[PDB]
Nanobody
Framework: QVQLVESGGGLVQAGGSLRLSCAAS????????MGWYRQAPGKERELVAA???????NYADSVKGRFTISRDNAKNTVYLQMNSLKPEDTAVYYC?????????????????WGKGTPVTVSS
């Protein structure tokens, strides 16, 4: 019933797996893009996975073939199944919802994000 609150993170050893989830604000299909950004202390924000309203997915190089972004319309929830975790994946993960609107005279781009969740992959 709570939204824009990333859950499912924690501490796991290398090779482990986690599954992060985030509920959307209303109809998750009204969304235009859903992404899972991550940032480690001392490092810059980086996009890890991004699904479009059509299902087209994009991934990063380090996470390709390991992390899997996905969506459930019934539960209005975006999912990131992280697998074969490596210590270089330790960071705080944020979920972002991008909404595009416009007409022949204007263009609006809303971005809503959550508080994040920590992921610690131990060596």
């Amino acid at each position: 019933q709570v939204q824009l609150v990333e859950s499912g993170g924690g501490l796991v050893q290398a090779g482990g797996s986690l599954r992060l989830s985030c509920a959307a604000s209303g109809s998750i299909s009204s969304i235009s893009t859903m992404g899972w950004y991550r940032q480690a202390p001392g490092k810059e924000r980086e996009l890890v996975a991004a699904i479009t309203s059509g299902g087209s997915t994009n991934y990063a190089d380090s996470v390709k073939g390991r992390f899997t972004i996905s969506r459930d319309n019934a539960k209005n929830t975006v999912y990131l199944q992280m697998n074969s975790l490596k210590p270089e994946d330790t960071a705080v993960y944020y979920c972002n919802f991008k909404y595009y609107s416009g007409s022949y005279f204007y263009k609006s781009e809303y971005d809503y994000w959550g508080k994040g969740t920590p992921v610690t992959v131990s060596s």
